[PDB]
Design an enzyme around this catalytic site. Structure first.
Site, PDB file in Angstrom:
ATOM      1  N   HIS A 118      -5.623  -3.178 -12.131  1.00 45.18           N
ATOM      2  CA  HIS A 118      -4.369  -2.666 -11.519  1.00 45.18           C
ATOM      3  C   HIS A 118      -3.890  -4.288 -10.346  1.00 45.18           C
ATOM      4  CE1 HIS A 118      -5.181   1.083 -12.732  1.00 45.18           C
ATOM      5  NE2 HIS A 118      -6.595   1.318 -12.438  1.00 45.18           N
TER       6      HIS A 118
ATOM      7  N   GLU B 140       5.552  -2.011  -1.168  1.00 49.90           N
ATOM      8  CA  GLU B 140       5.689  -1.217  -1.799  1.00 49.90           C
ATOM      9  C   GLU B 140       6.275  -0.143  -0.727  1.00 49.90           C
ATOM     10  OE1 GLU B 140       1.577   0.196  -2.486  1.00 49.90           O
ATOM     11  OE2 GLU B 140       1.947   0.355  -4.076  1.00 49.90           O
TER      12      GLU B 140
ATOM     13  N   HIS C 146      -2.504  -5.013   1.583  1.00 51.94           N
ATOM     14  CA  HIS C 146      -3.436  -4.117   2.352  1.00 51.94           C
ATOM     15  C   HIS C 146      -4.659  -4.238   2.825  1.00 51.94           C
ATOM     16  CE1 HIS C 146      -0.715  -1.269   0.152  1.00 51.94           C
ATOM     17  NE2 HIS C 146      -0.462  -1.754   0.938  1.00 51.94           N
TER      18      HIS C 146
ATOM     19  N   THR D 133      -1.663   4.878  -2.472  1.00 48.15           N
ATOM     20  CA  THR D 133      -0.323   4.783  -3.110  1.00 48.15           C
ATOM     21  C   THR D 133      -0.956   4.723  -4.325  1.00 48.15           C
ATOM     22  OG1 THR D 133      -0.981   2.215  -3.076  1.00 48.15           O
ATOM     23  CG2 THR D 133       0.605   3.225  -1.698  1.00 48.15           C
TER      24      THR D 133
ATOM     25  N   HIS E 213      -0.113  -6.067  -3.481  1.00 42.08           N
ATOM     26  CA  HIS E 213       0.842  -5.259  -4.622  1.00 42.08           C
ATOM     27  C   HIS E 213       1.906  -6.746  -4.760  1.00 42.08           C
ATOM     28  CE1 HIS E 213      -0.934  -1.004  -4.591  1.00 42.08           C
ATOM     29  NE2 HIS E 213      -1.224  -2.152  -3.526  1.00 42.08           N
TER      30      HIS E 213
ATOM     31  N   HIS F 299      -6.548  -6.125  -0.912  1.00 42.00           N
ATOM     32  CA  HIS F 299      -5.564  -5.970  -2.118  1.00 42.00           C
ATOM     33  C   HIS F 299      -4.264  -6.456  -1.543  1.00 42.00           C
ATOM     34  CE1 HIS F 299      -5.280  -2.039  -1.508  1.00 42.00           C
ATOM     35  NE2 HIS F 299      -4.055  -2.260  -1.637  1.00 42.00           N
TER      36      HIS F 299
HETATM   37 ZN   LIG Z   1      -2.497  -1.048  -1.701  1.00 42.70          ZN
END
Ligand SMILES: [Zn+2]
EC number: 4.2.1.1
Length: 259
Positions: free
Chosen positions: A63, A105, A118, A197, A95, A93
């Site tokens: 992911h 996000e 994050h 999330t 996004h 990590h």
């Molecule tokens: Zn995250």
């Protein structure tokens, strides 16, 4: 559809079927309306103590990718700000998007950033992260926006190993990485009560979102976009657009640490 992801048949609009809390009262991310967030003079400065951080591994987890830390002692800890007690750094990590106009996000007055970092921390009073995710004050996630411009030198060590973890399940040694090199100048922040999330979407997070983005270069974020969601031997699907859209605020209050 099936096991969750970010695609048409298994993405954010499907998650509520396996994780009904997806429609809960304190879901993340949210849009941060800067004019509505209230300056709270009672908030403390954030204490980010990363001097003794011990990175372990970097992993493509299907992911995103993550860098994991030794959280078996109070090495790298987050305290102060809106938090009561001490939160240990477990991992970080990202996004990110397929193009620079999406990927974050959280949004700020509906603005989407190219990516969001994050740093995930858990409350030591619950002893381990699995116990912490069952508590409303179990986790503190420090969120940092990325915009595209100048390179972030402290990110390059990460960028340069991504070709070794292209596909789901791949990992590598990633020792002696200093996460202080990922932080902006200012620790001014917004904070609100929310959730993970991604599945399991647990409502266990105090969010601390920094106002100041870091800048990364186009070459740096292009290397994120070469990662694959798929495992080796499966059809190649670029790991891009691994972000959940903003969720309803539902009468939560976003507080600002700054005027
Ligand atoms: Zn995250």
């Amino acid at each position: 559809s099936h096991h969750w992801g970010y695609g048409k048949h298994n993405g954010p609009e499907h998650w509520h079927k396996d994780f009904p809390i997806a429609k809960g009262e304190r879901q993340s991310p949210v849009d941060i309306d800067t004019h509505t967030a209230k300056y709270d003079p009672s908030l403390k400065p954030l204490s980010v103590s990363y001097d003794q951080a011990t990175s372990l591994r970097i992993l493509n987890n299907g992911h995103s990718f993550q860098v994991v830390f030794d959280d078996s002692q109070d090495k790298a800890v987050l305290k102060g700000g809106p938090l009561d007690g001490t939160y240990r750094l477990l991992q970080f990590h990202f996004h990110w998007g397929s193009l620079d106009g999406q990927g974050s996000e959280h949004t700020v007055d509906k603005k989407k950033y190219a990516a969001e970092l994050h740093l995930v921390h858990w409350n030591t009073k619950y002893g381990d992260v699995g116990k912490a995710v069952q508590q409303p004050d179990g986790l503190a996630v420090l969120g940092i926006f990325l915009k595209v411009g100048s390179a972030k030198p402290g990110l390059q060590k990460v960028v340069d190993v991504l070709d070794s973890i292209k596909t789901k399940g791949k990992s590598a040694d990633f020792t002696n990485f200093d996460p202080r090199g990922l932080l902006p100048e200012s620790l001014d922040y917004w904070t609100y009560p929310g959730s993970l999330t991604t599945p399991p979407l647990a409502e266990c997070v105090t969010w601390i979102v920094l106002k100041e983005p870091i800048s990364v270069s186009s070459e740096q974020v292009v290397k994120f976009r070469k990662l694959n969601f798929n495992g080796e031997g499966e059809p190649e699907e670029l790991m891009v657009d691994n972000w959940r859209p903003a969720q309803p605020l539902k009468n939560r209050q976003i507080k600002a640490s700054f005027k």
